[PDB]
Design an enzyme around this catalytic site. Structure first.
Site, PDB file in Angstrom:
ATOM      1  N   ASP A 416       0.698  -1.170  -0.061  1.00 23.50           N
ATOM      2  CA  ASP A 416       0.005   0.060   0.049  1.00 23.50           C
ATOM      3  C   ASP A 416       0.941   1.315  -0.030  1.00 23.50           C
ATOM      4  O   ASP A 416       2.030   1.333   0.162  1.00 23.50           O
ATOM      5  CB  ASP A 416      -0.926  -0.115   1.289  1.00 23.50           C
ATOM      6  CG  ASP A 416      -2.010   0.950   1.197  1.00 23.50           C
ATOM      7  OD1 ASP A 416      -2.539   1.434   0.026  1.00 23.50           O
ATOM      8  OD2 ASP A 416      -2.626   1.288   2.004  1.00 23.50           O
ATOM      9  N   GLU A 419       2.405   5.018  -4.279  1.00 25.24           N
ATOM     10  CA  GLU A 419       2.699   5.955  -5.348  1.00 25.24           C
ATOM     11  C   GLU A 419       3.803   6.606  -5.733  1.00 25.24           C
ATOM     12  O   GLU A 419       4.185   6.774  -6.853  1.00 25.24           O
ATOM     13  CB  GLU A 419       1.560   7.115  -4.980  1.00 25.24           C
ATOM     14  CG  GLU A 419      -0.044   6.371  -5.153  1.00 25.24           C
ATOM     15  CD  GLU A 419      -0.389   5.631  -4.051  1.00 25.24           C
ATOM     16  OE1 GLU A 419       0.029   6.048  -2.934  1.00 25.24           O
ATOM     17  OE2 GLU A 419      -1.201   4.766  -4.105  1.00 25.24           O
ATOM     18  N   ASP A 515      -9.543   3.561  -2.080  1.00 25.38           N
ATOM     19  CA  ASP A 515     -10.309   4.076  -1.250  1.00 25.38           C
ATOM     20  C   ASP A 515     -11.644   4.784  -1.479  1.00 25.38           C
ATOM     21  O   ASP A 515     -11.890   5.907  -1.975  1.00 25.38           O
ATOM     22  CB  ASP A 515      -9.705   5.552  -0.382  1.00 25.38           C
ATOM     23  CG  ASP A 515      -8.485   4.973   0.336  1.00 25.38           C
ATOM     24  OD1 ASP A 515      -8.377   3.787   0.775  1.00 25.38           O
ATOM     25  OD2 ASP A 515      -7.830   5.895   0.937  1.00 25.38           O
TER      26      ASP A 515
HETATM   27  C1  LIG Z   1      -7.387   6.064   4.967  1.00 22.53           C
HETATM   28  C2  LIG Z   1      -6.629   6.968   3.926  1.00 22.53           C
HETATM   29  O1  LIG Z   1      -6.193   8.285   4.522  1.00 22.53           O
HETATM   30  C3  LIG Z   1      -5.644   9.195   3.772  1.00 22.53           C
HETATM   31  O2  LIG Z   1      -6.650   9.790   2.699  1.00 22.53           O
HETATM   32  C4  LIG Z   1      -7.662  10.540   2.992  1.00 22.53           C
HETATM   33  C5  LIG Z   1      -7.048  12.021   3.151  1.00 22.53           C
HETATM   34  O3  LIG Z   1      -6.127  12.362   4.267  1.00 22.53           O
HETATM   35  C6  LIG Z   1      -8.360  12.974   3.696  1.00 22.53           C
HETATM   36  O4  LIG Z   1      -7.973  14.183   3.961  1.00 22.53           O
HETATM   37  C7  LIG Z   1      -9.659  12.702   2.903  1.00 22.53           C
HETATM   38  O5  LIG Z   1      -9.143  13.593   1.476  1.00 22.53           O
HETATM   39  C8  LIG Z   1     -10.159  13.768   0.767  1.00 22.53           C
HETATM   40  C9  LIG Z   1     -10.911  15.024   0.821  1.00 22.53           C
HETATM   41  O6  LIG Z   1     -11.465  15.025   1.941  1.00 22.53           O
HETATM   42  C10 LIG Z   1     -11.999  15.136  -0.369  1.00 22.53           C
HETATM   43  O7  LIG Z   1     -12.504  16.488  -0.309  1.00 22.53           O
HETATM   44  C11 LIG Z   1     -11.217  15.152  -1.849  1.00 22.53           C
HETATM   45  O8  LIG Z   1     -10.271  15.827  -1.947  1.00 22.53           O
HETATM   46  C12 LIG Z   1     -10.425  16.288  -2.975  1.00 22.53           C
HETATM   47  C13 LIG Z   1     -11.163  17.815  -3.258  1.00 22.53           C
HETATM   48  O9  LIG Z   1     -12.625  17.245  -3.221  1.00 22.53           O
HETATM   49  C14 LIG Z   1     -11.094  18.482  -4.732  1.00 22.53           C
HETATM   50  O10 LIG Z   1     -11.593  19.754  -4.560  1.00 22.53           O
HETATM   51  C15 LIG Z   1      -9.502  18.526  -5.283  1.00 22.53           C
HETATM   52  O11 LIG Z   1      -8.701  19.625  -4.461  1.00 22.53           O
HETATM   53  C16 LIG Z   1      -8.203  20.345  -5.294  1.00 22.53           C
HETATM   54  C17 LIG Z   1      -8.991  21.498  -6.262  1.00 22.53           C
HETATM   55  O12 LIG Z   1      -9.930  20.882  -6.999  1.00 22.53           O
HETATM   56  C18 LIG Z   1      -8.117  22.475  -6.580  1.00 22.53           C
HETATM   57  O13 LIG Z   1      -8.860  23.527  -7.226  1.00 22.53           O
HETATM   58  C19 LIG Z   1      -7.007  22.969  -5.815  1.00 22.53           C
HETATM   59  O14 LIG Z   1      -7.651  23.645  -4.752  1.00 22.53           O
HETATM   60  C20 LIG Z   1      -6.922  24.960  -4.361  1.00 22.53           C
HETATM   61  C21 LIG Z   1      -5.550  24.669  -4.059  1.00 22.53           C
HETATM   62  O15 LIG Z   1      -5.408  23.525  -3.016  1.00 22.53           O
HETATM   63  C22 LIG Z   1      -4.899  25.617  -3.515  1.00 22.53           C
HETATM   64  O16 LIG Z   1      -3.676  25.545  -3.409  1.00 22.53           O
HETATM   65  C23 LIG Z   1      -5.131  26.950  -4.481  1.00 22.53           C
HETATM   66  O17 LIG Z   1      -4.341  26.571  -5.887  1.00 22.53           O
HETATM   67  O18 LIG Z   1      -6.428  27.130  -4.563  1.00 22.53           O
HETATM   68  C24 LIG Z   1      -7.128  26.122  -5.281  1.00 22.53           C
HETATM   69  C25 LIG Z   1      -8.640  26.588  -5.416  1.00 22.53           C
HETATM   70  O19 LIG Z   1      -8.402  27.785  -6.262  1.00 22.53           O
HETATM   71  O20 LIG Z   1      -6.178  21.964  -5.412  1.00 22.53           O
HETATM   72  C26 LIG Z   1      -7.117  21.020  -4.526  1.00 22.53           C
HETATM   73  C27 LIG Z   1      -6.126  19.951  -3.926  1.00 22.53           C
HETATM   74  O21 LIG Z   1      -5.141  20.467  -3.360  1.00 22.53           O
HETATM   75  O22 LIG Z   1      -8.948  17.264  -4.989  1.00 22.53           O
HETATM   76  C28 LIG Z   1      -8.821  16.783  -3.617  1.00 22.53           C
HETATM   77  C29 LIG Z   1      -7.827  15.612  -3.470  1.00 22.53           C
HETATM   78  O23 LIG Z   1      -6.441  16.074  -3.818  1.00 22.53           O
HETATM   79  O24 LIG Z   1     -10.765  13.614  -1.801  1.00 22.53           O
HETATM   80  C30 LIG Z   1      -9.765  13.503  -0.768  1.00 22.53           C
HETATM   81  C31 LIG Z   1      -8.772  12.283  -1.124  1.00 22.53           C
HETATM   82  O25 LIG Z   1      -8.121  12.346  -2.145  1.00 22.53           O
HETATM   83  O26 LIG Z   1      -9.773  11.383   2.701  1.00 22.53           O
HETATM   84  C32 LIG Z   1      -8.747  10.639   2.180  1.00 22.53           C
HETATM   85  C33 LIG Z   1      -9.236   9.259   1.779  1.00 22.53           C
HETATM   86  O27 LIG Z   1      -9.460   8.392   3.118  1.00 22.53           O
HETATM   87  C34 LIG Z   1      -4.416   8.537   2.795  1.00 22.53           C
HETATM   88  O28 LIG Z   1      -3.943   9.416   1.930  1.00 22.53           O
HETATM   89  C35 LIG Z   1      -4.826   7.396   2.091  1.00 22.53           C
HETATM   90  O29 LIG Z   1      -3.701   6.554   1.684  1.00 22.53           O
HETATM   91  C36 LIG Z   1      -5.510   6.392   3.301  1.00 22.53           C
HETATM   92  N1  LIG Z   1      -5.710   4.864   2.672  1.00 22.53           N
HETATM   93  C37 LIG Z   1      -4.885   4.065   2.824  1.00 22.53           C
HETATM   94  C38 LIG Z   1      -4.553   3.587   4.113  1.00 22.53           C
HETATM   95  C39 LIG Z   1      -4.878   2.401   4.715  1.00 22.53           C
HETATM   96  C40 LIG Z   1      -4.433   2.168   6.031  1.00 22.53           C
HETATM   97  O30 LIG Z   1      -3.298   1.735   6.256  1.00 22.53           O
HETATM   98  C41 LIG Z   1      -5.583   1.150   4.142  1.00 22.53           C
HETATM   99  O31 LIG Z   1      -6.530   0.766   4.881  1.00 22.53           O
HETATM  100  C42 LIG Z   1      -6.503   1.917   2.839  1.00 22.53           C
HETATM  101  O32 LIG Z   1      -6.793   0.631   2.233  1.00 22.53           O
HETATM  102  C43 LIG Z   1      -5.280   2.784   2.011  1.00 22.53           C
HETATM  103  O33 LIG Z   1      -6.110   3.031   0.855  1.00 22.53           O
END
Ligand SMILES: C[C@H]1O[C@H](O[C@H]2[C@H](O)[C@@H](O)[C@@H](O[C@H]3[C@H](O)[C@@H](O)[C@@H](O[C@H]4[C@H](O)[C@@H](O)[C@@H](O[C@H]5[C@H](O)[C@@H](O)[C@@H](O[C@H]6[C@H](O)[C@@H](O)[C@@H](O)O[C@@H]6CO)O[C@@H]5CO)O[C@@H]4CO)O[C@@H]3CO)O[C@@H]2CO)[C@H](O)[C@@H](O)[C@@H]1N[C@H]1C=C(CO)[C@@H](O)[C@H](O)[C@H]1O
Ligand SMILES: *[C@@H]1O[C@H](CO)[C@@H](O[C@@H]2O[C@H](CO)[C@@H](O)[C@H](O)[C@H]2NC(C)=O)[C@H](O[C@@H]2O[C@@H](C)[C@@H](O)[C@@H](O)[C@@H]2O)[C@H]1NC(C)=O
Ligand SMILES: *[C@@H]1O[C@H](CO)[C@@H](O)[C@H](O)[C@H]1NC(C)=O
Ligand SMILES: *[C@@H]1O[C@H](CO)[C@@H](O)[C@H](O)[C@H]1NC(C)=O
Length: 830
Positions: A416, A419, A515
């Site tokens: 796991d 990446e 996930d």
């Molecule tokens: C259990 C697992 O735990 C971990 O994963 C977790 C995350 O830690 C947790 O935070 C959560 O993450 C979710 C979010 O809640 C959810 O919202 C979604 O995130 C999305 C956004 O929805 C989406 O908007 C997009 O964000 C972008 C914007 O689109 C973009 O415009 C831009 O926004 C701003 C930017 O940030 C600024 O810098 C600036 O530029 O302004 C802009 C806007 O103008 O960027 C953002 C992103 O930065 O995309 C987001 C995703 O990046 O989805 C996420 C998940 O990706 O939930 C997850 C899932 O639980 C660990 O990472 C994971 O590995 C782990 N799972 C393993 C662990 C175990 C235990 O050993 C195993 O049991 C499991 O099987 C494993 O899979």
């Protein structure tokens, strides 16, 4: 504008010898946008087989990054070029594909099929539109093709969560391995598979080919219906076209190149239980105990990062998961014919009293940035990442796994966070166009910098390979090392499950959708993802049943086990911040479980034969309807139904509070595998409303198919000790056929030289007065030594009953026929 393109400088076909094409391309004019253009291009076209066309475009004056042969072995390039518009045409007499090089300005090329005189890949530019040109800069490659918007049905280009299996028009697919949850639609996920399948609905219906771009760099792919375009930020163009002409043959040609799907052990097709957050040995023992009491088959027990000592690999929590208790626990699992699989992360915690870290530092196995091992951040805390491109790091990995396996028996490995996942984004190196690329791919759907939550592009691997190029290979490489480690520590066929994947991973590991969430959308999402990974050569695929993240509901879990019991890889798993979701916790779901998992276990020999076919021809276990019915255009867009093998269709309910389903039925007679009387008959393909009770799922078998089934049991071990039931579904259009592959369930090389396996083929044909059922046996030895006996034959699809010397059902009992002995049975109509 962006680029001016290239002209053909010289082009020739190597006469007499094996036909291939070589050409030199010269930049028309320099452009500053997205970096400097490559001045001279070496262009070659060559047939690797009669049904495979290779197009390789490289810098004529520079060796660019290519995926190593050691990582993905393949035929070497042809020779490179020497130092109405004109055309150079390459063709082979036994090939259906014709390559044409057009000496226009800028130049173009096409691949068209002789069989239908139809264009399959068309890279001819629109002179006024630079978005259609070939552009070739150091960190921006652009390759574009036009498509007959309506006739071209595209599939693949993972890994992405989409509501539909077929690719929607007007979208950008980003391929960049990232730790992004699969409950997010559209976004780039854990893996990268730059392959698509193109099914043509016209002129000749069902006509299929495949397109693969052998490149591991980040890329945006733009699909607008009438055009598809690659925007790649490095590497070269190494393009492979697979002739087909059927969907089956394409995956055969594809996996022939990237590697046949690794065989899976028999026990892997049993049900798995896992959870992030099992507190101690006492709790996992209890879970196993309760599955038994519910009389729900449980084959494999998994342990997440909980078992480790503060989330460090190759350790055991001396308090919650002490060694002696775990030794006992695994011993008892084995004694009851059950298995055990623990998880592994790639990150090695920088603990000075930690044996794995100490040894890893001695062999110098960690990925470096700016001369020092790159400091990462995952579960145990600060970590270093093993460089799985370093053979010394691969030896170190095998060593660590050997050591751990000595003190604790394991039946497989779950890799796991590969990446690689990183919790703290590093600052970009000043003045670096690697950490700050000129063209930003649509990472995480917002042009997010590629270094986000992973290892910086400026980190270095063995042989001076940048992370920039080898990023999408990381999970692929660890899968190779892990499988190597398993093979050298145990004589049994290994099992592994990987999150991060690349094209070719299926030759080494199994995959799960990652996930997902406990939402009705994700239940449906599991199906396109499942069919996609079949195309990607990873037939061993499944999603976390009842959803990983967020808490599940009784109805969602009930409908999910009904569907999930037919995933090739069937496993319950969830996060710790959600409620428990073992199948015994609700009676309505446990009753569903026993039903669906009952049918699955009966279908174990069937699933195993399909796995055999997969390793042999690349053909997926869970496959799209158009695989069996390519002439039915209505099947192309189905995303809610699928097939297990050739003739078994699953039609689940994917919406709450429903008791019916509008499922599509291709032409022919279908019969429920739950009720041989319940049948569906249509003279032309059509949707049909099916009664779908809260505990029921529609699973039907199509005519013309013979399936060998055994009996239900609590374990796969016990199931193989049961008699064989032969299910024969007849057809007035064709003789029914079937296939059964038998081995010890754990031989290293499946179906290899020697005789630890048996293949059996079944055949059935109705005459006016007589019905004939017969088998053919290859390598009769093994099956004979297993005392497998067939005592029943059920015959469907007939309107008249039969017996030994609407529709009806006929059963033949007390047969005692030895499976490993060829037979011809004669029946008579009444
Ligand atoms: C259990 C697992 O735990 C971990 O994963 C977790 C995350 O830690 C947790 O935070 C959560 O993450 C979710 C979010 O809640 C959810 O919202 C979604 O995130 C999305 C956004 O929805 C989406 O908007 C997009 O964000 C972008 C914007 O689109 C973009 O415009 C831009 O926004 C701003 C930017 O940030 C600024 O810098 C600036 O530029 O302004 C802009 C806007 O103008 O960027 C953002 C992103 O930065 O995309 C987001 C995703 O990046 O989805 C996420 C998940 O990706 O939930 C997850 C899932 O639980 C660990 O990472 C994971 O590995 C782990 N799972 C393993 C662990 C175990 C235990 O050993 C195993 O049991 C499991 O099987 C494993 O899979
Ligand atoms: C290096 O590994 C050691 C062995 O796992 C860590 O010690 C253990 O930490 C556990 C909690 O993480 C604790 O329950 C164990 O009792 C303890 N065992 C021993 C033998 O010390 C060690 O953790 C560090 O030391 C302890 C006292 C805490 O302060 C932790 O926060 C420390 O990190 C690991 N050290 C490092 C630097 O990671
Ligand atoms: C089997 O299906 C038939 C046709 O729908 C139905 O009439 C019959 O009652 C079913 N039997 C059982 C036991 O459900
Ligand atoms: C069925 O066919 C066999 C072989 O052709 C023949 O010997 C037998 O008499 C036939 N039986 C009937 C009932 O016609």
């Amino acid at each position: 504008a962006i680029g001016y393109g290239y002209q053909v400088k010289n082009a020739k076909v190597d006469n007499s010898t094996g036909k291939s094409l070589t050409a030199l391309l010269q930049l028309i004019r320099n452009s500053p946008v997205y970096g400097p253009d490559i001045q001279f291009l070496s262009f070659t076209a060559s047939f690797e087989e009669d049904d495979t066309l290779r197009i390789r475009i490289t810098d004529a004056n520079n060796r660019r990054w290519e995926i190593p042969n050691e990582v993905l072995p393949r035929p070497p390039p042809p020779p490179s070029p020497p130092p109405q518009p004109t055309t150079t045409v390459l063709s082979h007499p036994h090939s259906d594909l014709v390559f044409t090089l057009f000496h226009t300005t800028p130049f173009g090329f096409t691949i068209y099929r002789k069989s239908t005189h139809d264009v399959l890949f068309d890279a001819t530019p629109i002179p006024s539109n630079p978005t259609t040109f070939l552009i070739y800069k150091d960190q921006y490659l652009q390759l574009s093709s036009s498509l007959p918007a309506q006739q071209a049905h595209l599939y693949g280009l993972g890994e992405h969560t989409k509501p539909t299996f077929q690719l929607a028009h007007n979208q950008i697919l980003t391929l960049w391995n990232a730790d992004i949850a699969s409950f997010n639609r559209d976004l780039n996920l854990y893996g990268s598979h730059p392959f698509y399948m193109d099914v043509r609905s016209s002129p000749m219906v069902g006509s299929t080919h495949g397109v693969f771009l052998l490149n591991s760099n980040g890329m945006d792919v733009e699909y607008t219906g009438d055009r598809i375009t690659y925007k790649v930020i490095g590497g070269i163009i190494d393009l492979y076209i697979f002739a087909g002409r059927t969907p089956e043959m394409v995956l055969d040609q594809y996996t022939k190149l990237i590697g046949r799907p690794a065989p899976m052990p028999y026990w892997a097709f049993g049900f798995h239980q896992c959870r992030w957050g099992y507190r101690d040995v006492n709790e996992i023992e209890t879970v196993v105990d309760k599955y038994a009491e519910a009389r729900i088959p449980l084959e494999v027990m998994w342990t997440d990062i909980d078992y480790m000592d503060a989330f460090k690999d190759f350790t055991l929590d001396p308090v919650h998961f002490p060694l002696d208790k775990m030794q006992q626990f695994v011993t008892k699992l084995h004694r009851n014919g059950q298995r055990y699989v623990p998880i592994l992360d790639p990150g090695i915690n920088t603990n000075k009293s930690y044996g794995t870290f100490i040894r890893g530092m001695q062999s110098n196995v960690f990925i470096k940035r700016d001369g020092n091992p790159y400091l990462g951040s995952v579960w145990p805390g600060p970590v270093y990442y093993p460089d799985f491109l370093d053979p010394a790091a691969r030896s170190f990995w095998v060593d660590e796994i050997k050591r751990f396996r000595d003190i604790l028996p394991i039946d497989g490995i779950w890799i796991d966070m590969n990446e690689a996942s990183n919790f703290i984004t590093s600052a970009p190196t000043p003045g670096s166009t690697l950490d700050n690329p000129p063209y930003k791919i649509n990472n995480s759907g917002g042009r997010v910098p590629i270094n986000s939550k992973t290892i910086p592009a400026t980190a270095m691997h063995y042989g001076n390979v940048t992370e920039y190029n080898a990023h999408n290979l990381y999970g692929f490489l660890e899968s190779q090392a892990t499988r190597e480690a398993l093979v050298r520590t145990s004589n049994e066929r290994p099992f592994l499950l990987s999150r991060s994947t690349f094209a070719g991973s299926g030759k080494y590991t199994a995959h799960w959708t990652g996930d997902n969430a406990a939402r009705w959308d994700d239940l449906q999402y599991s199906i396109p993802t499942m069919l996609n990974f079949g195309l990607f050569g990873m037939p061993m695929i499944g999603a976390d049943i009842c959803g990983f993240a967020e808490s599940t509901t009784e109805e969602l879990c009930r409908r999910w086990i009904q569907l999930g019991a037919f995933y090739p890889f069937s496993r319950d798993h969830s996060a710790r911040d959600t409620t428990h979701q073992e199948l015994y916790l609700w009676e309505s779901v446990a009753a569903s479980a026993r039903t669906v998992l009952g049918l699955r276990y009966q279908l174990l020999p069937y699933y195993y034969t399909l796995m055999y076919d997969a390793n042999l021809r690349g053909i997926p276990i869970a496959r799209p309807l158009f695989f069996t019915f390519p002439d039915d255009v209505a099947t192309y867009g189905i995303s809610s139904q699928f097939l297990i093998g050739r003739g078994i269709m699953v039609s689940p309910v994917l919406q709450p509070g429903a008791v019916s389903v509008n499922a599509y039925f291709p032409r022919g007679n279908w019969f429920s595998l739950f009720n041989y009387t319940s049948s569906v008959s249509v003279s032309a393909g059509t949707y049909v409303s099916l009664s779908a009770p809260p505990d029921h799922i529609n699973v039907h078998i199509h005519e013309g198919n013979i399936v060998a089934m055994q009996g239900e049991a609590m374990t796969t071990q016990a199931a193989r000790s049961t008699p064989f039931h032969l299910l024969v579904v007849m057809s007035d259009h064709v003789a029914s056929t079937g296939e059964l592959f038998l081995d010890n369930g754990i031989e290293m090389d499946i179906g290899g030289p020697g005789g630890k396996w048996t293949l059996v083929r079944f055949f059935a044909e109705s005459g006016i007065n007589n019905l004939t059922i017969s088998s053919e046996v290859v390598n009769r030895g093994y099956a004979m030594s297993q005392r497998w006996v067939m005592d029943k034959i059920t015959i469907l699809g007939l309107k008249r009953r039969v017996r030994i010397k609407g529709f009806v059902v006929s059963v033949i009992s007390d047969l005692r026929q030895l499976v490993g002995q060829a037979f011809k049975l004669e029946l008579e109509f009444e």
